[PDB]
Amino acid sequence: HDSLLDSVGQTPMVQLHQLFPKHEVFAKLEYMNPGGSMKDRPAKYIIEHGIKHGLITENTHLIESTSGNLGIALAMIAKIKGLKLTCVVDPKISPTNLKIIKSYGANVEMVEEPDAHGGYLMTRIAKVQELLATIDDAYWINQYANELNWQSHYHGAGTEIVETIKQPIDYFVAPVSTTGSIMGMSRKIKEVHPNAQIVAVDAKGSVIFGDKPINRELPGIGASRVPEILNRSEINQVIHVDDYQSALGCRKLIDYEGIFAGGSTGSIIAAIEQLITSIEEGATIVTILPDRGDRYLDLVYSDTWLEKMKSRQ
Amino acid sequence: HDSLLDSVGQTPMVQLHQLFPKHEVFAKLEYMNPGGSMKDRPAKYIIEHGIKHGLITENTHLIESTSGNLGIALAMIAKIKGLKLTCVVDPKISPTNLKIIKSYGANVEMVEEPDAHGGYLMTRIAKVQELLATIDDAYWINQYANELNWQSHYHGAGTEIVETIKQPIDYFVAPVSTTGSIMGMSRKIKEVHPNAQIVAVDAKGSVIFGDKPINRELPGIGASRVPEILNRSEINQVIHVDDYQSALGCRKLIDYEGIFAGGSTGSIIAAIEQLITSIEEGATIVTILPDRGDRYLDLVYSDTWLEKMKSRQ
């Protein structure tokens, strides 16, 4: 490979035999991408597209609002391409992920005022618009509305999944924030497996699917606005999980399978444990594990954080 | 794959075009192994061997003295195999790596008394012998003396390198602690490229190759005893680098290539920059990048740690 860019994708798939002994449950390890998450795929895809089409030159200042993983992916790619980048972030970001963005030489704008229900997305978007107003040659990645987001997953893990799974897929389960992953992957999966059931896993208190908004702790799952790239008619079921439940799911996965994953992976485990009680034995379930446990030592893998979240419920 | 075990190995190789524009410098990304370092390979190899040969059963308590990466690899594998594990560690371990070992459910023994020159290896070995004396069914991985260590690298990255590089290899450069990586990989490389020059990169103050021992900060490179698996006649050149120089090398690599790697990778960059002044333009240099930058935010990627080390020199 001529660079790191060439090592994005083609991630491993494993079966979770120990955790789910009566079902065929397969997990795509997207956290093994070089930047450390699934978001490596939309970052590569959007930036290469923009350069090809004259939207992004060496003078273009990239801007994005992120809970952490897309900021890290964008900063890696920007280093390789010689581009400037400013990440707009909020106080809920993983402290580890905030320091990583800075080590990659990205500019950081940290907002401080949440809305009436604890969410910082409205304030992040406003900060982005302010940066756009004062930076002459700037390009907003705009992941909640950019069609290239779900397209990158259609061609990425979505395609790899249907190339690799040698049996009918009964359920596809994915966590949501922009819904790029689940829209893109499900669209590819259903071309081959048209009766596959599509299950979104979301945070309790996320308005994506119409919950009453409430303050959420874990970054990366859930949102306080409805993403524009979501098409609700393509989702068959929604399951909501809270911060405490997601943390328990992380800790059970590492105990049962030796897999050390981030918060939204815990949300997926907790949701699949709720789902399988209804599912015929032997059925095939496919999911994705978006990022690494490494980044959540002050959150999910902190016993005092765990105890704090248990009190909240 | 039936588990994570099956995703160990087959890591990417990239050329460092930007950093070394007049030479062909190839880097094996061993930090992309599932546990996060090269040490995944000896952990898998030694444990599978022991189980196959009746040295390790479900009742066997694994013990090892480690600067961090082998402890993490062993804890991942032990989870998957249902084995008990105690890691003996010292105050120089990365705080992040110490917390990861604990999240994987391993027991931890932290020693506290260094020898006359700041090294903790003598005390770690003593602690290991004490654990051996009081635990009835225990097996010491013993990585500084275990031949299975260098064998795992012969069959691992060593084999992959000679399968992948399509030109004569002029130099092979690797960092050392147990010397398992450099002994194993160089032995395989020289079967195909018998005139390749083998270059060890070591910490200043490491006694591995006979330096006067002095207090070293960065864990993972250097040692305060001579490893038994080292054969000095197989090494052509040795280059020593200090803590500050290694940190500068990490920061230059991420700036030039978008690669975010740990301390010993910085040592490799600093040594290769010293070496190439003597090397014919166009020559092929192969190296390995053992682990992730993620784990060194309180060390190499901390500006105050950086400033502390600059004062020391």
Ligand SMILES: C=C(NCc1c(COP(=O)(O)O)cnc(C)c1O)C(=O)O
């Ligand atoms: C919105 C972003 N995160 C998405 C994300 C998601 C949601 O993926 P989406 O494709 O955005 O729906 C799940 N899990 C983790 C760990 C994530 O980081 C971001 O990185 O800025």
Ligand SMILES: C=C(NCc1c(COP(=O)(O)O)cnc(C)c1O)C(=O)O
């Ligand atoms: C001795 C151990 N570390 C080896 C190591 C090395 C040296 O590899 P050896 O094969 O032990 O020589 C280089 N770089 C890093 C980041 C390492 O973690 C250990 O993980 O206990």
